[PDB]
Symmetry: D2
Subunit: 274 residues, 4 copies
C-alpha cells in the first residue's frame, strides 16, 4: 500500500468528488477521517447522512478504518472537534484534502452580497479552517505530510458569470502558495489539483448548463457533452472524479515526495487550449 500507515482528512466526503477521494486513498492503504455538512441557494444534489454512511461502507470494504462525522468547514470549532477525535483514535493526520466547495451563478453587476459571502466562506475561509485545524498536529508530529487543495481551472483563469467562484479558487491558490512558504520547512508538501469540467452533479447541473446554453429549455447531459467537449483538447467531454482523486493520491505518495507549490491541471488540456 503506497499510503500504508497514513491517515487522510477529507472534506465533502458524503458524495461526489469527496467520496471518490476517500475510496481512492483507502485503496492505497490510508485510514480516513471524513466530514460533510450532510445538508441540502445551490442548484444540485449535495451530501446526505445516508450518503456519508455509504462512504463509510465503501472505505471499510477496502479493509480500512474510518471516522465519519457531520461537520461544517465554515465553522472552526466544528472542525477542531473532529480533528480532536481523529487524533485520539488514530494518533495522527498525515494528509489533508481540502475538497471542492460550492458554486452558483451570476454576472458582476447581478451577483448579491449573499452569493459572495457564501462562496468565500465555504470555498476560501473553509479551506483555511481545515488547514488551521489540522496543521498544528501535523507540525508537532514531526513526520511531515501533505496538504492538497482541490481547486479548479477557474483558480487559474477567469470565469464569466462566476466571478465570485473564480475569485474564491484564485484565493485558494494564494493560500496554497503562502502555506507552501510557511510549512515547507516542516516537510509538509502543499499543492493544488485544478480540475476543469468533471463528471459530477455539481459540475453538470442544469442551472449552470442554462447559463452557458440560455437558448435551450432543458439542457441535457448530451448538450453538456457537446458544450464541454470543445474546451478539452483530448477527445473527452470532461474528466471523471476518479482522475482528480488519482492525482490527489499520487501527490500524497513518496513517488511525489518533493513536489511542492504545484498547481496540476486535471482538465484534458482546457488551460492549454490555444
Amino acid at each position: 500500500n503506497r499510503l500504508q500507515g497514513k491517515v487522510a482528512f477529507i472534506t465533502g466526503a458524503a458524495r461526489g468528488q469527496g467520496r471518490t477521494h476517500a475510496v481512492r486513498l483507502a485503496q492505497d492503504g490510508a485510514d480516513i477521517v471524513a466530514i460533510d455538512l450532510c445538508r441540502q441557494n445551490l442548484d444540485y444534489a449535495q451530501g446526505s447522512p445516508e450518503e456519508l454512511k455509504e462512504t463509510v461502507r465503501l472505505v471499510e470494504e477496502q479493509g480500512r478504518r474510518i471516522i465519519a462525522r457531520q461537520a461544517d468547514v465554515r465553522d472552526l470549532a466544528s472542525l477542531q472537534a473532529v480533528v480532536d477525535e481523529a487524533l485520539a483514535e488514530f494518533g495522527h493526520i498525515d494528509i489533508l484534502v481540502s475538497n471542492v466547495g460550492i458554486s452558483n451563478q451570476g454576472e458582476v453587476v447581478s451577483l448579491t452580497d449573499q452569493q459572495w459571502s457564501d462562496i468565500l466562506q465555504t470555498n476560501l475561509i473553509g479551506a483555511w479552517h481545515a488547514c488551521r485545524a489540522v496543521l498544528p498536529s501535523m507540525i508537532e508530529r514531526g513526520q511531515g505530510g501533505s496538504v492538497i487543495f482541490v481547486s479548479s481551472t477557474v483558480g487559474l483563469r477567469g470565469a464569466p458569470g462566476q466571478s465570485h467562484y473564480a475569485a474564491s479558487k484564485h484565493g485558494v491558490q494564494g493560500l496554497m502558495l503562502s502555506l507552501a512558504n510557511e510549512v515547507g520547512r516542516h516537510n509538509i508538501r502543499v499543492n493544488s489539483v485544478n480540475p476543469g469540467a468533471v463528471n459530477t452533479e455539481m459540475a453538470l447541473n442544469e442551472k449552470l448548463l442554462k447559463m452557458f446554453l440560455p437558448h435551450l429549455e432543458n439542457p441535457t447531459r448530451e448538450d453538456a457533452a457537446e458544450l464541454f467537449s470543445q474546451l478539452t483538447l483530448l477527445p473527452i467531454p470532461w474528466v471523471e472524479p476518479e482522475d482528480v482523486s488519482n492525482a490527489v493520491a499520487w501527490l500524497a505518495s513518496d513517488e511525489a515526495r518533493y513536489i511542492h507549490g504545484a498547481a496540476i491541471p486535471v482538465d484534458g488540456g482546457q488551460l492549454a487550449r490555444a
Copy 2:
C-alpha cells in the same frame, strides 16, 4: 490632457496611494469622485482622515478640476451607491474606476484569526466587487466604454508567508479581474490590474509589518526597510513610489492603452522576475 472630459471614481483617496491616483488623473484632465472611510481602524499604520480628504480636494481643485469627495465604506454597497448616484447627478457619467489598495495585517496560517480573514476579504475582495457593482451599470448604459483598474499587488501573483489572507484576497482580485474582463469587454470597458511590489507608503513600510520580516530587530527603521526590500528588486531601488503606480493607472485609462485588456502589470522594479 489625455483624460479630458472623463470622470474617475477612486477608493481610499484621503491619503497615500489613493491620493496620488486622484492627483495624477486630475493632472491629465479627469474630474474626480473620491471616497475614503476616513476612520483609523485592527491595522498598524496611519489611515485616512476627513482632514486628509479635504487636502485631497484642495490638490485636485488646484489642478483646475472638479471633485466630489465623500466619506463612504466600500464594505457596504448601499454607501457606495449613494456616492455613485450623487456623482452621476452632478457629473453625468463615471468613465474610470480605480479600485485601490485595501488593508492588511500579519499572521501565519496556523495563527490567523477568523476576524483577520473576514476583515481582509470584506475590504479587499468584496469591497472591490462592490465598487464594480456600483459603477458598472451606468458605465454600460452610457455606452461609451471606460476603464476598470484594480490596484492589486505582487502577492496577487505569488504567495506571501505570514500574509496568506492578504495574498488570498489579492489573488481573488485577479480572479475577479479576469472574469469581469470576459463579461464587459464587449461594451468596450477595459479591465486590468496594476501589481506593485514594495511601495513608499505608510501601509507597506509600517513597523509591525517590518518586524514580521525582521523579528530580531527591536525597532526596525526605514533604513532597515531599504536594506531588506532592496534585495527583492532587480533595479537598484528599495521600493517604487506611489506616483509610479498612479502613472500606470493613468496610462491604462488613456487612448494610448485603448486595447490593453485582461493584463496584470507589475510595478515592482523586477521583484516578480527575480530568479
Copy 3:
C-alpha cells in the same frame, strides 16, 4: 517630448510594426537607428521590408524633426549589427532604447515542419534578438545612464500555437531571454520587458497563406474573413489591434512614467489571453 534626447535602436524598421515604432518613438522626441534586411525572403509568404520602404521610414522620422541613421543589416549576423552600432555610436554617442522587433514566421504542424523552418525562425527571432542585445548592451552598460530593452514578442510567447510550434518556441525563447537579461542588467538601471501583441493589422499577421491554415474550409480567404475569425478571439469588439497600439506600449515603457516597470510581459491583444 517624453523621450527627448534618447536614441532608439529598432530592428525590422522598413515597414509594418517596425516603421510604426520608429515613427512613434520619433514623435516622442527620440532620434532613431533603424535596420531592416530589406530582402524578400522566399521562405516567407507575405510582403517584407524593401530599401524603398526603409527610405519612406526615414522620411517619416525626419518629418517629425528627428535624426535617423537607417541601414540595411542582417540581425542573423553579429558582425553586421556591430557595424551599425559602431556607426550609431560614432554619430549619436549613445543608444538608450533597444526595440527588438517581431521577426518572421511560416506554418507547419510538428510532424510537417522542416529543419529549415526551425533553423530560419530561431535564427531571426531568437538568436537575432540576442545579437541585438549582445551588440547594443556593452555601450549601454559602459555609459552608466541606464536604458530600456523592449522585446516585441507575441501572445504565442505566452501560449501554444497549433500549426506554428517553431514560431511559438521562438517567442517563448524571447521571454526566457527577456527574464534572464532582466536578472543580469537590472543592477545597471537597464529595464527589460516584453510587449506581446495578439492579432495585429499587418501583412505578417494577416497574410493569405496563414489565413488558409486557420480557415481550411475557405479556398481564398479575404481580410473580411480574417476579421470574422479573429474577432472571436478578442474580448474587446475589434478584429485585431493596430501596430500603432503596439508602438504606444513600447513608447510608454521607454518613458520615465514606466521607469520602474521591469520583467513585465504586457499583452496588447484586446483580451485574447484572458478569454475564458
Copy 4:
C-alpha cells in the same frame, strides 16, 4: 506494472537523468528504446558507450527488452533510423521522454554564437526532432500515447548567466503547448516535467558552481542550493523526476494534458 505493454523512447539514456527514466519505466513494465550521443564545451561528465551498456544491463535486470543505440538528436535522419528499428522490433512506440540536454555559462553580453547554436540545437531542435521522428507512427497506430518533455525550472523563470539555456527550455514549453493543441485529438497527451536543482553532474558541476559562488565542493553546492528549496533538501534526486515521468505515462494520469509539473521542492513557489 502500470506501463505493461508500452514502449518508451528515451533520449540521453546513457547516464544521469536519462538512465533513471529508463530503469524507472522498465520497473513499471515498459520496454525501452534508449539513445545517447555517447561522446564527451561542457564542463561535466557526459554519456559514453560503456555507460549505455550498463543502462541496458539495469533495464534487462528488470526483465524488459531494450534497443540501445548511439544517435544524435541534432540529426533527424539519425533519429529516424533508430525509430525505424524499434518499430521493426516492437511494432510501436507509446511514450516519448525528451530528456534533458546540455548547458554552459555566460552573461548575455559574454555568450558566443557557438554557445547559443549548441544549446538550441540539442535542447530545442533536438526535442523537436524526437517528436518529428516518433509522432507519425504514434498517430497512425491510433492508440494514443504520451510525450513528456524533461524541461527545467528555467523554462518557467529567467536564469542569469544562462539566458541561452533558459531560452531553450522556454522554447521547449512553447513546443509542448503547441504540440498539445495539435495531437490532443489523437489522444496523445503532451506535458512537461520541470526539475530545479537535481543530483546530477550536469546540474552540479564545478564550472557552474563557480558562476554562482564567485568568491570560491558538493557541501558548497548543498548550502547554496538548500536556500532555493522550501522543503529541507538541497536538490531533488533524478529518481524523483523519473517518478513524475512514469506517473504521467500511466492510466492514473490519462487526462493530464498541457501541464508543466515542477519537480523542485518548492523553488518556483518561493516568495
